[PDB]
Amino acid sequence: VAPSVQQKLETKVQESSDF
Amino acid sequence: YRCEQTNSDTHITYQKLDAWAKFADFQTRIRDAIIKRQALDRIMIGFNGVSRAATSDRVANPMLQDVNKGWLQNLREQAPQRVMKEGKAAAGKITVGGAGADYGNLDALVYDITNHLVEPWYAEDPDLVVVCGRNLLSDKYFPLVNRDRDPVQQIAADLIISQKRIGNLPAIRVPYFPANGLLVTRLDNLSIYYQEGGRRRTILDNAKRDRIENYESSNDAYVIEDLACAAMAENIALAA
Amino acid sequence: GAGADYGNLDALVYDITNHLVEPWYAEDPDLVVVCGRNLLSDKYFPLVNRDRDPVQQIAADLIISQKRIGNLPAIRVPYFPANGLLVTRLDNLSIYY
Amino acid sequence: LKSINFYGVPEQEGEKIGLGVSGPVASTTDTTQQDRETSDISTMDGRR
């Protein structure tokens, strides 16, 4: 029907907390 | 200071675990992310915690204003003269040089705080810094370049933008700081007093509800070591 | 030109960087401002047109030497849209062939 | 164009999904008459 949409996984980086 | 309990808690439904089963490390990665989030969330309370309500409403106070007393609230309770709630003859706020004349730019406001609210023997401490969020610092440097400066002044403005100091004090980027607010203190003056042995970490595989749960009750207390060197301003109506 | 709405282009680049770019990547040293050659020309033009004093002239030459815009290096790129300005580290931009 | 990235993706379509969290996760609840209601914040959204 329609091609499979290949997916990778990005980790959404949060705000840096070195405070 | 009551090192009172905070109920950090995360559940992963079986459905989310199963539907993303192709990514082998999927589960682990969310754990890493949540660990990072938790630490960030920690400091977030430390500045937005206005009170500790018996029940947390994630919709009423999404800033976590009712989970604990952040350092800022301690100022607003103990030694409330440190909290410059309103400026000189303004209307329930601190205006800047846009409206007539009150503290001019932000530099004069932090200077006045440093030499009238911080204790004398700390006002000249080299380690005194100014904690601020993103709106006020960025918008403080903004009128350096928004005024159509001449080339020498543009070189100088770029240098000033490079130097993150507010007034004469080094500035600290801090996420989730209450906008229109400014803290002047030493970073060594701020502390987390958590109860040792208060790590009620537990990992529950709650099949009854079909979710992998994880509890961390943490007894913590956002405490300012000394109020001699912890001043602040609220409602910095930074006119544009 | 009229009022005060992001003043000179450097003020606009500063606001874009510090309000729209992620607050943690706002200071990546490789954050470069991608904009067409003609736009940089039109923003550096006032530095030499408004009849400034000689010491301001040498300062102007120094700035024109620095391709840096706002406070960020500017990448002169052909065929860029007129009256547009992108900002991103040049490793965001990928072509998946 | 020497600075642009060139990746040889072996498929016309596809997505990369960012795995974020929906905000604060830590809160407090008095369990005298309540539960430590646990909430999920893990969100994920993908570019195509």
From TrEMBL, chain B:
Record-given protein name: P2 family phage major capsid protein
Organism lineage reads as:
Viruses, Duplodnaviria, Heunggongvirae, Uroviricota, Caudoviricetes
